[PDB]
Amino acid sequence: TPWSKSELVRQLRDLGVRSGDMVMPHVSLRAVGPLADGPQTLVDALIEAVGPTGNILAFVSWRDSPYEQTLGHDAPPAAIAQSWPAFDPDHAPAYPGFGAINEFIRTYPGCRRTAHPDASMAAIGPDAAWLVAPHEMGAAYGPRSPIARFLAHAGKILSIGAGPDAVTALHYAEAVARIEGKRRVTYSMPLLREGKRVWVTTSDWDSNGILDEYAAPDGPDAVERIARDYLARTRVAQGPVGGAQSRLIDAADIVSFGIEWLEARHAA
Ligand SMILES: CC(C)(COP(=O)(O)OP(=O)(O)OC[C@H]1O[C@@H](n2cnc3c(N)ncnc32)[C@H](O)[C@@H]1OP(=O)(O)O)[C@@H](O)C(=O)NCCC(=O)NCCS
């Protein structure tokens, strides 16, 4: 029997979600189980749980991000530069690998989208515009990014059946951590500025591992190692959301732990 919207709202309430909260969900729909009206039932429940003054922030990225196609180049290769679609924030589908719920969040009426094609964030609520902008190339997840403002607004991270590797906010911790040998990457993104496609090439911290030892693809990254150590040492509200075991995490607390975690193991 599929989970109803009212059943999920009660579960979110038991977990500690309050009206007015700013919540960032990481969802495994298969862990949740069948819903009354598909994934939209959970989206409606998330919006009701945070209330009209609350906010939802999701890391949705872009299904057709030219990340690997322009990685390590001072400019987009010619074939990529001539034909790749410009990132149209209100029309670009989310990256499926980060959760099928993100395409439902992203198309919700009133949802705003950041202009960073690879690190794109979707936001719903009164603070949606303030969260999504600015989001410039070179500030994917560190200061001046939606995550930074999310951390300055008592944000809560809502893992719904997702693994510890899915804590996007911890990319802020590795962006500001004062450690040696932080990996950087160079890539190009096609922005849509006043209807005109503009190619922008930038450098930023590697979001696939801030250090060499954390960047192997086989392969727990720094986010997963930090999150597991945090969840092993911290009392965190846990409970069911649908059929998925869920956690409500204080975003500023796990990021502070992440900074201390990185700086304790690597010199400055
Ligand atoms: C990796 C991960 C996404 C895999 O979890 P998953 O449950 O297997 O995959 P999803 O949550 O995206 O959803 C899968 C289900 O939704 C279905 N689905 C996809 N689009 C759908 C649609 N429009 N309508 C209905 N169902 C849809 C899929 O077909 C699948 O259903 P199925 O079992 O019948 O085949 C999850 O574990 C996770 O980590 N999510 C957080 C990811 C994240 O935020 N990463 C950030 C890193 S910085």
Q: How far apart are the first and last CA of the chain?
A: 54
Burial (Cβ within 10 Å: 0-12, 13-18, ≥19) of residue 164: buried
Spatial CA neighbour of 54 closest among 24, 89, 26 = 24
Structure tokens at 181: 């040998």
User: CA distances (Å), 133 to each of 142, 212, 254, in order?
Assistant: 14, 31, 24
Per-residue burial over 20-55, b if 16 or more Cβ lie within 10 Å, else e, is ebbbbbbbbbebbeebbeebbbbbbbbbbbbeeebb
33 Cα: distance to centroid of ligand 1 (angstroms): 11
100: Cβ below 6 Å to ligand 1? yes
Query: Could you identify the atom of ligand 1 that is nearest to the CA of residue 30?
Result: 7
| 80: containing domain | 1-268
What are the backbone dihedrals phi and psi of residue 5, each rounded to the nearest 5 degrees, phi first? -60, -40
26 marked as part of a ligand binding site: yes
Residue with tokens 């009354």: 36
Pairing of strands 184-193, 112-113: unpaired
Number of domains the chain is built from: 1
Read off the DSSP letter of residue 250: E
Ligand 1 mean position, distance from CA 30 (Å): 7
The protein residue whose alpha carbon is closest to atom 19 in ligand 1 is: 100
Amino acid at 108: Y
* 190 conformational bin, left if phi > 0, alpha if psi -120 to 50, beta if neither: beta
The rounded Å distance from CA 99 to ligand 1 centre is: 4
